[PDB]
Amino acid sequence: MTTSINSVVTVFQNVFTNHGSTLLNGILIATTVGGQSLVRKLTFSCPCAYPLNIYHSLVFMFGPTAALLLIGITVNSTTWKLAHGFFFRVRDTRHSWKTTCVSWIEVLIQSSVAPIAWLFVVFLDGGYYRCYRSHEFCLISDAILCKNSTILNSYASTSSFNKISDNGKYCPPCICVPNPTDASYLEAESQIYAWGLLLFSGVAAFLVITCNRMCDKYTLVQRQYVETYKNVETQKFDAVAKEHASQLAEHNARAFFGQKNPLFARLRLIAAEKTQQTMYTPLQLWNDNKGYRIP
Amino acid sequence: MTTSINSVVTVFQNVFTNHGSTLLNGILIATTVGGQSLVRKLTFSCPCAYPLNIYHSLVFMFGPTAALLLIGITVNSTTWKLAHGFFFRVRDTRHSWKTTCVSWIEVLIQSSVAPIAWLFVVFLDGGYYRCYRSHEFCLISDAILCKNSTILNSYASTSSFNKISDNGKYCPPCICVPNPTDASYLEAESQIYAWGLLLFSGVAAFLVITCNRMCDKYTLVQRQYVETYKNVETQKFDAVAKEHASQLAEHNARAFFGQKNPLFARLRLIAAEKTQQTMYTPLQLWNDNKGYRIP
Amino acid sequence: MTTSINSVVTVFQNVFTNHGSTLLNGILIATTVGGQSLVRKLTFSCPCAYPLNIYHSLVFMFGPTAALLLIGITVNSTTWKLAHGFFFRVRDTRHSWKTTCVSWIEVLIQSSVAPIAWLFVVFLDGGYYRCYRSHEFCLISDAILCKNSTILNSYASTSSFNKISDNGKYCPPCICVPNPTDASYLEAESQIYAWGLLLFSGVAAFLVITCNRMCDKYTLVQRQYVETYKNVETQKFDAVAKEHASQLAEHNARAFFGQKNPLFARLRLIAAEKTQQTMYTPLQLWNDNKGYRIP
Amino acid sequence: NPLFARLRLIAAEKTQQTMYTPLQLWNDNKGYRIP
């Protein structure tokens, strides 16, 4: 199933080079799927225990989701433009409660793209979901008794049998390997939960990013121009900041080997803005407010 | 069947580099078919259950169709030019009810190219359709009884046989693997449904895109010039918007390190227009209406 | 498990080329993981002794952590800017007690990135943690008696058996290889401790580097400009120092084959500074204080 | 450019400050604080 999902990686590399909502993290998601298909070639360590099988399945599922959710927050620039130095903002430059929640849900969804994709990848594998209800099916309270004292584990594996003892309640190696009828049943149960999660996330994400492209105040040419102007001023401003710091570092380095902007400007110079005026991306709005009235 | 359909992918790469209706998504469709032939090299997980086999077949068929239909909507530009910010259009700039349905059916067909192609690819495989009426043939109500309690599954697989028990009503492994006579019969049943769907879609699509190239008001040289002018102004306008935002970001970045267009224009600047006048693609029609009378 | 974690190395090479806190050591960490996956292909020497198994496991875990912690200190520049020549600083140029602890915790966390990653890599292997409680499970006080005199080791391996003698308290080869039920149990115990450590470190590191990006005085554009100015003056100052020493070495080399700056400046020229004034990175603050008043 | 800028942009000035020729003095007073 590795080369199949790698071909799917090439397909959605073509997708994340075509379009989407944004594309700041489309490089990393396809590399995660294309590398962790080959990880899933060597997985399901899948212990033979009552609590540790649920732990090794539940942690291994809902752990990298939280990890990639945290990475999708922290790498995403806009949340830092919301909350880089939230304590020491000069007052009334932090903007609102309603708009900051819209930006918060924006960065949450742009973050949560990648963990939903990873969850769909592993649920789409016949993997750690069989390692979950392979436990939860096996009637395992006698293996609680078997692991109260490991002498019972030894004499349940060796003296009494394992699959001949499939009558009552079971001790371990049903856990690490089930019946292949049960294994295939629960494997495709994982496949249908995988596609149900993917289709639910796709429909809900389509509906949300449509309802924030259909309730958008600006319209499609005006929105493409605001996005082009945003994407050019947050590069041209950085190029001018770099050459300004480079000249003032040139002169201050020459200043040493020849011996022998208030917070209001640096805070109106920061986005997560209102889009209610003809000017926007509040470098413009600061510039209209204070000096240098027009360019 | 993988390299065969990959050769078909190369053939229809030549086709989608020759002609068609449009070619904005012809790159991705051939990559989907050429990668998911190799996906179909490793498929039919195909569970041994009464409801889950129909679920794992029906979801796996009609799920990626809806997913690629949603992708074919959202990637396609024209529907956003219909409905990017449909709430906050300045009134009477949204145009009609009849013309917007023509554009809606246009983006629906240009979307639905790729799911019909994917449906034909998987039906053309002997795949998840055998995984559908392999269930629906097998007389499976005794497997409902077998999966009311999995002890009956165990003693139907082990104690009683599976293919020696082909007399009455069946319990699982008929489901996961049928008789090869039945399998080949139902496989080519899937092949003839595949080609029936493809030929029906091809005839209907030919008839529709002919009846919207034969009921077209403009004629073939005038239509090729309107398409060339559209395809050059929605690139030249973006180049001028980029260099305009670049100059006004240059000057506004220099404006900060030296301290120490109403909605009517941005809405008549948007397509999904009437083609009833000598001017068209309503940047021209706006320009004829308001200032800068001729170029 | 080698190529899997090498694919993870490629993924987090993409991560450490995207973003983070800093990236001065992101080259070396991925090379450590990608090379020591292939080291872990040939590991668990794992002796058959009572004290030496715990020693060979505990030293091999908590040794390279201390080694990479020491390397992460010494390679990191900022701690030397705190304490290169701490004895012979001219007095009141060493700054405070509170701020130097903030820089100390900064260099401790930037150091401790790599040992936590290495600890997670080896705990994520089924490795030297099975080589720890494979000892601690095996009831080994009879192997203390067996290694009080190695004649008992010889007659415990040869005359009496090893796995037939799994009744009471055990002598060696249980240690070097346990029961595979126990081995897989304790292996996935190591996996869940691995992910628990990784998730705890990730949540705590996110919370700390957020609480020192949310309690930051400057804000995100001002902080990016201070970081750009810092990253350009500690290169432009070095280029001017190099060409100044090159001219004064040119002239002093010509000065020999033609025969036949107090400590205050060199100490205010050093960082780990206060960020309380409009000027910062105290080359600027020195320059404002003493001569060459402005550039 | 209001009349205040076009009037502090005009000489016959005081020479009492470190800046002079009152384009400089206007520039120090109002925006564009230093060159």
Residue numbers in the entry:
A (entry chain S), B (entry chain T), C (entry chain R): 1 to 260, 278 to 312
D (entry chain G): 278 to 312
Task: Give the authors' words.
Calcium homeostasis modulators (CALHMs/CLHMs) comprise a family of pore‐forming protein complexes assembling into voltage‐gated, Ca2+‐sensitive, nonselective channels. These complexes contain an ion‐conduction pore sufficiently wide to permit the passing of ATP molecules serving as neurotransmitters. C. elegans expresses only a single homolog of CALHM1, termed CeCLHM1, in its sensory neurons and muscle cells. In these cells, CeCLHM1 forms a Ca2+‐sensitive ion channel involved in regulating the function of excitable cells and maintaining normal motility of the worms.
